[PDB]
Amino acid sequence: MEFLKRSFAPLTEKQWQEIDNRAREIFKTQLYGRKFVDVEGPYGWEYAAHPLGEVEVLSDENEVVKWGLRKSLPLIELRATFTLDLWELDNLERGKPNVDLSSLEETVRKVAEFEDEVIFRGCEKSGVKGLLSFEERKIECGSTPKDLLEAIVRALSIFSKDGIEGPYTLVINTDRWINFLKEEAGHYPLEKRVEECLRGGKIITTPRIEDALVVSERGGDFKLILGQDLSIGYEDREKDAVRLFITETFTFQVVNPEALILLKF
Amino acid sequence: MEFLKRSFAPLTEKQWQEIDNRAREIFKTQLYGRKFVDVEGPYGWEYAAHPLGEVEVLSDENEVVKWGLRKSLPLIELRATFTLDLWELDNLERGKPNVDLSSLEETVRKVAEFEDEVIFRGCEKSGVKGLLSFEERKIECGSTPKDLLEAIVRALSIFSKDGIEGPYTLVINTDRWINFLKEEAGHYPLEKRVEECLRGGKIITTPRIEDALVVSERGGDFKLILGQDLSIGYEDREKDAVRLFITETFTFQVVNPEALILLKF
Amino acid sequence: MEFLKRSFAPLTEKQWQEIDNRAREIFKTQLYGRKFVDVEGPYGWEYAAHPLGEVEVLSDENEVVKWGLRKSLPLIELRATFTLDLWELDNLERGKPNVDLSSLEETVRKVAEFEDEVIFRGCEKSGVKGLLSFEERKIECGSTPKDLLEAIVRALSIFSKDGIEGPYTLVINTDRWINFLKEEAGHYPLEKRVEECLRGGKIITTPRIEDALVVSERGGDFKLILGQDLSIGYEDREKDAVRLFITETFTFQVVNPEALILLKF
Ligand SMILES: Cc1cc2nc3c(=O)[nH]c(=O)nc-3n(C[C@H](O)[C@H](O)[C@H](O)COP(=O)(O)O)c2cc1C
Ligand SMILES: Cc1cc2nc3c(=O)[nH]c(=O)nc-3n(C[C@H](O)[C@H](O)[C@H](O)COP(=O)(O)O)c2cc1C
Ligand SMILES: Cc1cc2nc3c(=O)[nH]c(=O)nc-3n(C[C@H](O)[C@H](O)[C@H](O)COP(=O)(O)O)c2cc1C
DSSP: OGGGOGGGSSOOHHHHHHHHHHHHHHHHHHOOGGGTSEEEOOOOTTOOEEEEEEEEEOSOTTOSSEEEEEEEEEOEEEEEEEEEEHHHHHTTTTTOSOOOOHHHHHHHHHHHHHHHHHHHHOBTTTTBOOGGGOGGGEEEOOSSHHHHHHHHHHHHHHHHHTTOOOOEEEEEEHHHHHHHHHHSOSOSOHHHHHHHHTTSOEEEEESSOSSEEEEEOSSSSEEEEEEEEEEEEEEEEOSSEEEEEEEEEEEEEESOGGGEEEEEO | OGGGOGGGSSOOHHHHHHHHHHHHHHHHHHOOGGGTSEEEOOOOTTOOEEEEEEEEEOSOTTOSSOOEEEEEEEOEEEEEEEEEEHHHHHTTTTTOSOOOOHHHHHHHHHHHHHHHHHHHHOBTTTTBOOGGGOGGGEEEOOSSHHHHHHHHHHHHHHHHHTTOOOOEEEEEEHHHHHHHHHHSOSOSOHHHHHHHHTTSOEEEEESSOSSEEEEEOSSSSEEEEEEEEEEEEEEEEOSSEEEEEEEEEEEEEESOGGGEEEEEO | OGGGOGGGSSOOHHHHHHHHHHHHHHHHHHOOGGGTSEEEOOOOTTOOEEEEEEEEEOSOTTOSSEEEEEEEEEOEEEEEEEEEEHHHHHTTTTTOSOOOOHHHHHHHHHHHHHHHHHHHHOBTTTTBOOGGGOGGGEEEOOSSHHHHHHHHHHHHHHHHHTTOOOOEEEEEEHHHHHHHHHHSOSOSOHHHHHHHHTTSOEEEEESSOSSEEEEEOSSSSEEEEEEEEEEEEEEEEOSSEEEEEEEEEEEEEESOGGGEEEEEO
């Protein structure tokens, strides 16, 4: 809201709607992690830390009053700025239906890639552990279309041992998926065989990872914690151009790593 | 209920709900026998024996008053104890969403494997005869995907001879199933061909057996008799830890072995 | 509440009321800091951190997506255990009006002294800065009853420069106060002259500090942040005795150090 200073940028309401609409479209398809994790919040611009429900004891062993500090995950605040040419935006008022927003588009994709980098590969300085670091959840079959279907059936038996119900979802690197389709030399559609072995599951292709993984979407196992959802604000004018910024506050927690299986081809 | 002594364990209601929930999830997927047998009861903590409807005659051949004893199946009571660390459980109150229940999980899987051992392999001392001991219900085709489909069509013709209607269900070792899928080198999905040859039946993969079997689920042929369903109780504290236990009372009876066919690969 | 496990200690309701009453009486007079700071909360047993409203920037200077971590004060959780003799407590049921609670009293005073140690001298490991560390708020007159009254008039003129209204309160070491009364050799009551120079203020004597200070009580300048207020719980029995514990979660923040003046005699 008001902390974004939007009402001080020299832009008409229609020009704000054009900027917001384009950013929303791109975030919808490029925030790959949000396609299968749980999203909590938003808790607001002031939210600073998410409790871990532990105490780190700091007193000496023989103190009458023993004490320690409660532990929490600090939220990450990101800010990515970009400039738009003001004359080009004014053509929207003249009726132009395709004003150039390339700088916005470039920045939106960098932010999307930053968030997915935390979800998948974690952030040491913030104490976030990403999905791909739970190495003990890794199984290894091979690099052949048959190897993939077997790995999926094995994965669902491992889930069964831990009492993890479905629905189940395969997340797989885009190029790998394409390579698997090429091998299947004119046959029953591989995509259909995969949905079957997932017992009616989903397939999400992505460039964010190099192999694949299987997750349960029963809910409550992967939590994206949002303070402020992705928003666009105003910084300052710089003659002919307006400097805007994208911002959000968030952190991430793998609650139950049993709902996760890493596939190594 | 009250015989479990739950209200004497030093645990909050929320901590009891966490223990119970996790055990329920695992029992749901690991009690393989319950997925296709009939479940009678529960008849209560006091139930001691299930009548067989026979008399064993013990008098001599030339007695005026002839007599014998009614026969019954005695119920099996099992108890499996395990300890939980009390400080770790108290973190649940601090807001921790993933307290460590590994000891519970380990014990729940041992109990699940005990029950399935009675259903499938029987219990001589209790007089239970398990599914896999009815050797006269065994047919033998071979170890090839085609051999399996043929065996299923033959099985359903044997059921027809005995007047056993469906729906029919294939229970098959997990590794065997995976091996059958590997052989079927990129073709129409084997799972679809199997459901067809079962006339719209079901497939249950399991590690509890080494080959496979086909059963009718018309009802009334395989009875799991429950006194007390699986429950968690409290035994005693032992400094920093609470000793809990899992318990149930039950027995098992194959009423109509005609509703059962054993496959030998 | 339920996380304190109170209902598992073998004590009657009347015996709990006796323990709680005695602890309350002592905390009322021995928590000296609470006599003039603001008390926020309680926010609950789960509260873990209090936001500072800042961001620590961690990205490199030339990154497209710049980022950092929100900052907060982690709450301190303290726990102090103590044992009570169970036979002695049972005399309360026999009608005894003065059962021996010396162990409770000793522990309550250690906890009270711990909290006041944070408020006055801070806690480096938790990042709390105590009242007595704001050295730039220190003025120095001398060690004579006249020096004290002058220091107070000077203090209130310094407050006026910063726009800090009253009412004003003098916090002074007990022995110092007694020494000032001895010097005033039979005259108009020093306590009356001090209240006058404070413009109708208050005097709080305490052993927690070695000199004195003057604070405004306008409100909103010294915040004690409470998660869980001081509470008594149950740990375990140990034959003839019950082991109880005192606990709280809290932190402290000097918001406006202009509302504070340190006196050095
Ligand atoms: C996380 C972050 C937050 C910032 N927030 C503000 C702000 O609220 N007000 C301000 O005047 N400058 C702020 N700055 C400094 C710059 O003026 C500007 O916001 C710019 O975004 C700097 O970083 P960026 O261009 O990479 O996004 C912030 C910088 C960072 C790195
Ligand atoms: C089937 C079985 C039932 C038992 N029932 C009780 C009981 O009801 N009360 C008791 O004090 N001890 C009982 N005990 C003895 C032990 O105190 C405790 O229950 C423990 O469970 C022993 O067996 P376990 O640890 O393998 O489960 C039982 C033991 C077994 C083997
Ligand atoms: C801050 C602190 C919190 C503790 N909380 C628990 C708890 O919640 N449950 C438990 O079984 N033990 C807990 N312990 C460990 C001991 O069992 C017991 O609580 C005891 O209080 C140890 O510290 P103390 O005697 O100095 O208070 C805690 C210990 C500390 C130092």
